[PDB]
Structure formats: structure tokens, C-alpha cells
């Protein structure tokens, strides 16, 4: 996260760290959506241009974390993966269209003060909140700058951007399955996700029921926090039919 701040304890209890077994290292962010299911970006697991194609046994998920590097004894819980599901129409070739994946844990995780699931939006909440100017929150342990790394979880609040502005910021073909967020050059304030924040949640707090909803997944950006560029997020609601199909069929 670029130009963010340290998270408060328990501020994002759905935050998950995707952790490589060997060598032991951060792979990505992710989020907890139930006691058995974790949501992330497909490119965290499958990205052929970089020779990335992880299998279940390659990975761990660490839940309830705050420190990036410490083993947080008595607080974090570490889980093995039963199965990975990647969206069948995930477009890693062109533009990361449908950049979404689910991971089923081998065993349910116990909720605590530091571990708790985020809500997924229904159609109405998506329609109400996914509007230009409305702000969401992005969290992660990724790089602090494009070109170092944080001691603890970072947080930044960012406004959703008008679709035509998103489109005009890039040569990449944008789709309805993405939205973009970030400040404009003229707005002064700044901030963005960066490398290592991939797969983490873009969340919004509903003013209707005071619950946090995951509206986006950290997907891509041309660099990090560049003027005139924006961060692009997987549109969780647009892909929810797939999410529900996977959970209903395999869980």
C-alpha cells in the first residue's frame, strides 16, 4: 500500500495473507468470507507470463495477522488449502478480466477478536454503494512504493472513479467486471495498492446496516500511485453468481 497508514488492531479481521511454503514468503492478500472459504485474485495463483501456477500444497493462508513478518503466536491462525477454484473465464492473456479465485480451507477456522468474515454484496448494496466519488478501503502488506516493505498491515481509503476516466487513463481494455479507484492528479491526496497487495479486499461500510462489504479485489495498476493512473479492482458483485455456484457445489 502506497501512502497509507498502519492499520489499527482488529481493523480488518477478514484480511488474509497468502503465504508461500518454500521459500517462506508473502504471495498475496486475500479475504475471509466464511469459516471455510477465502477469496483472492486469480493472478495470485495463476499467471503464466511470470511462470506462476500454484497448487494447493504450495501454499498456506495466515489469518488474523497484523505484523507482516512476525509469527503472531496466540493470535494468527495458519490454514492449509483443500482446493483452489479459478474463474473459468479469467483472462490472464489480455486484461485480467474476471480476476477472481476461491480457496477452500482443509478445516474451518475459529473466529476471534482478530478473525472474522466480511460480507459479500447483494445487488442492492452494490447498486447503492458502487458510485463515483464514494470511498472504499484497501488493505495489505504489499510494497510501500513502486520502486520498501511495511512492518504491519497498511490501510488506505480511496474514491471510486467515473468509468470514462478509468478508461481514458489507460490503453488496457477495461471491462464491466472491473472498477477503478484513486485520487485524480488535481485532488492532491494520493494512495494506491501495490505489488504484494494483489488479492486483498476493497471494502465499504454500508450506511444502511453498518456492515462491511467486500466490493472489490485488488487486481492491477500501471505501476503504483502514479499521477493520472488508477488502481483496478475485480467487481465482486458482477462475479457473485460464480462465487455462489462454487460454494454451493463444493461446500
Amino acid at each position: 500500500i502506497v501512502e497509507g497508514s498502519d492499520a489499527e488492531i482488529g481493523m480488518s479481521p477478514w484480511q488474509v495473507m497468502l503465504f508461500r511454503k518454500s521459500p517462506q514468503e508473502l504471495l498475496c492478500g486475500a479475504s475471509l468470507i466464511s469459516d471455510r472459504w477465502v477469496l483472492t485474485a486469480a493472478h495470485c495463483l495463476l499467471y503464466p507470463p511470470w511462470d506462476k501456477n500454484f497448487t494447493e500444497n504450495d501454499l498456506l493462508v495466515r489469518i488474523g495477522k497484523h505484523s507482516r513478518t512476525r509469527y503472531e503466536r496466540n493470535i494468527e491462525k495458519i490454514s492449509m488449502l483443500e482446493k483452489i477454484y479459478i474463474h473459468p473465464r479469467y483472462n490472464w492473456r489480455e486484461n485480467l478480466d474476471r480476476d477472481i479465485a476461491l480457496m477452500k480451507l482443509k478445516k474451518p477456522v475459529a473466529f476471534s477478536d482478530y478473525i472474522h468474515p466480511v460480507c459479500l454484496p447483494d445487488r442492492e448494496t452494490a447498486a447503492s454503494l458502487l458510485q463515483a466519488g464514494y470511498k472504499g478501503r484497501v488493505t495489505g502488506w504489499g510494497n510501500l512504493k513502486e520502486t520498501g516493505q511495511p512492518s504491519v498491515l497498511q490501510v488506505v481509503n480511496l474514491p471510486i472513479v467515473e468509468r470514462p476516466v478509468c478508461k481514458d487513463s489507460t490503453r488496457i481494455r477495461i471491462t464491466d467486471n472491473m472498477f477503478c479507484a484513486g485520487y485524480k492528479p488535481d485532488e492532491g491526496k494520493r494512495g494506491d495498492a501495490c505489488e504484494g497487495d494483489s488479492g486483498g479486499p476493497f471494502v465499504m461500510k454500508s450506511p444502511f446496516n453498518n456492515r462491511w462489504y467486500q466490493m472489490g479485489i485488488v487486481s492491477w495498476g500501471e505501476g503504483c500511485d502514479r499521477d493520472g493512473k488508477y488502481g483496478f479492482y475485480t467487481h465482486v458483485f458482477r462475479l457473485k453468481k460464480w462465487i455462489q455456484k462454487v460454494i454451493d457445489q463444493f461446500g
Binding site: 518454500s22 517462506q24 508473502l26 498456506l60 513478518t69 512476525r70
Partner: peptide, 11 residues
Amino acid sequence: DFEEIPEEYLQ
């Protein structure tokens, strides 16, 4: 660099 995690999780 990361603090080592309990071996039970690597098994």
C-alpha cells in the same frame, strides 16, 4: 525476512 512458522504447518 520472515520469522519461521511452527513446523506443524509445513507438514
